[PDB]
Amino acid sequence: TYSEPAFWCSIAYYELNQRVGETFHASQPSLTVDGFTDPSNSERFCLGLLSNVNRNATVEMTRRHIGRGVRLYYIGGEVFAECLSDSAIFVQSPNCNQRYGWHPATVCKIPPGCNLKIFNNQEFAALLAQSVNQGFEAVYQLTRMCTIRMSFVKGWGAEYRRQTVTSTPCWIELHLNGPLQWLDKVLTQMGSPS
């Protein structure tokens, strides 16, 4: 039995290697993740109110520059990220990377005022159907397509001194619930380890 996800995504915020704050769940098509402080807007994930007694000076400076942050929106089977901050954001989306023929770990800069299509549901569904013919492991690995990680201000990977997302001072992890439920409908039918 299945029911349509009430929330199209969940978002967790981290500073370096530490989770900070509660998970945010989005139920309207557009949301903003910003650096401000309203605790009670279901369409704003306000990171500026979140505490971390262990945070260092680099994180404090980065948090000052989040500002208007990122708008994330889900329209017509596609997910978009728009950089509203006056500092860039950096996105690692394997679905986006595959579409452009980039390495799966690619981290793409989105400068202020720019946007990027970070997910396309039809491309995922086509990959899921192809993966069924390739076996359990191929389908199981698609869980990674349903997670997108994004850092504010600071890049990571390739040329950067920071090589992992957990080295960035402020980052978020988005789970796309519709793709996860689609994946469940297939994975549960692929057959048991014996």
Partner: peptide, 20 residues
């Protein structure tokens, strides 16, 4: 495999995504 129900489940999802 793959099991027939897994192929069928993926087929319906691909149709749902294309309509969307």
């Amino acid at each position: 495999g793959p099991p027939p129900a897994a192929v069928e489940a993926a087929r319906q999802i691909l149709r749902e995504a294309q309509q969307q």
